[PDB]
Paper text:
Here, we identify a previously uncharacterized H3K9me2-binding protein, which was named AGD-containing protein 1 (AGDP1). The AGDP1 protein possesses three pairs of tandem AGDs (AGD12, AGD34, and AGD56), all of which can specifically recognize the H3K9me2 mark. Our biochemical and structural studies reveal the molecular basis for the specific recognition of the dual marks H3K4me0 and H3K9me2 by the three tandem AGD cassettes of AGDP1. Our studies identify an H3K9me2-binding protein that regulates heterochromatic DNA methylation and reveal the molecular basis for the specific recognition of H3K9me2 mark, thus establishing an additional linkage between H3K9me2 and heterochromatic DNA methylation.
As an alternative, we successfully obtained high-quality crystals of AGD12 of the Raphanus sativus AGDP1 (RsAGDP1), which displays 83% sequence identity to AtAGDP1 and which also specifically binds to the H3K9me2 mark, in complex with an H3(1-15)K9me2 peptide. The AGD12 of RsAGDP1 adopts a classical tandem tudor-like conformation. Interestingly, the H3K9me2 peptide adopts a unique helical conformation with the four residues from H3K4 to H3A7 forming a short α-helix. The intra-molecular hydrogen bonds constrain the peptide into a contractive conformation that is distinct from the commonly observed β-strand-like or extended loop-like conformations. The AGD12 of RsAGDP1 employs a large negatively charged surface to accommodate the H3 peptide with the side chains of H3K4 and H3K9me2 inserting into two adjacent surface pockets of the AGD1 and AGD2, respectively, highlighting the important role of H3K4 and H3K9me2 in the recognition. The unmodified H3K4 forms hydrogen-bonding and salt bridge interactions with the acidic residues Glu89 and Glu45 from the AGD1, and Glu45 also interacts with the unmodified H3R8. The dimethyllysine of H3K9me2 is accommodated by a classical aromatic cage formed by Tyr122, Trp127, and Phe144 of AGD2 by hydrophobic and cation-π interactions like most reported methyllysine readers. In addition to the aromatic cage, a Glu149 residue can form a hydrogen bond with the dimethylammonium proton to strengthen the binding and facilitate the selectivity for dimethyllysine. In contrast, the AGD12 of AGDP1 uses the shorter edge of the interface between the two AGDs to bind to the H3K9me2 peptide; as a result, the peptide must adopt a condensed conformation to allow the simultaneous positioning of the H3K4me0 and H3K9me2 marks into the two adjacent pockets.
Author numbering:
A (entry chain A): 26 to 173
B (entry chain P): 1 to 10
Write the structure that this text describes.
């Protein structure tokens, strides 16, 4: 019944977004455990998180049934110009924080490759090293913006 | 280990 995006198959690595307010602007890494088959009673996918667990002692990685629209492929590998790109004020970035990626905007660049990032939904202003940031991309119409 | 409870911001 539903035509899944081609990247979505059992075993596929994905980034997972949540509908919950406390996760606004985040992408958590995970993998697909199950998808609707052409033979199916659901329209949903089950995913397993890579860095979130059911329990704080860490015995079982968290699994969730999610909407297809909550998933996208892993962000594109950082290119060669993108390693040459300086991060600048105004840039849309994701910051690695609490073991997932959170979208924000660079508001200040300091020396020694450090920056301050504003997060609109949480009204937070947080400093990061360059190696904690990635340039933000969007998965739209089956392709990345900006493209690969 | 990280859980939704210790990752979420609200």
């Amino acid at each position: 019944r539903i035509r899944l995006p081609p990247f979505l198959k059992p075993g596929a690595a994905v980034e997972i977004s949540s509908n919950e307010s406390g996760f606004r602007g985040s992408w958590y890494m995970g993998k697909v455990v199950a998808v609707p088959s052409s033979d199916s009673t659901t329209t949903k996918c089950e995913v397993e998180y890579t860095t979130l667990f059911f329990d704080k002692e860490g015995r079982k990685r968290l699994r969730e049934v999610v909407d297809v629209g909550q998933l996208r492929p892993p962000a594109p590998a950082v290119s060669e110009r993108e390693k040459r790109r300086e991060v600048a004020v105004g840039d849309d970035v994701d910051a690695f924080y609490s073991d997932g990626w959170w979208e924000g905007t660079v508001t200040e660049v300091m020396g020694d490759g450090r920056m301050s990032v504003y997060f609109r939904a949480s009204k937070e202003q947080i400093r990061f090293r360059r190696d904690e940031l990635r340039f933000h991309r969007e998965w739209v119409n089956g392709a990345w913006r900006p493209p690969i | 280990a990280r859980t939704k409870q210790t990752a979420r911001k609200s």
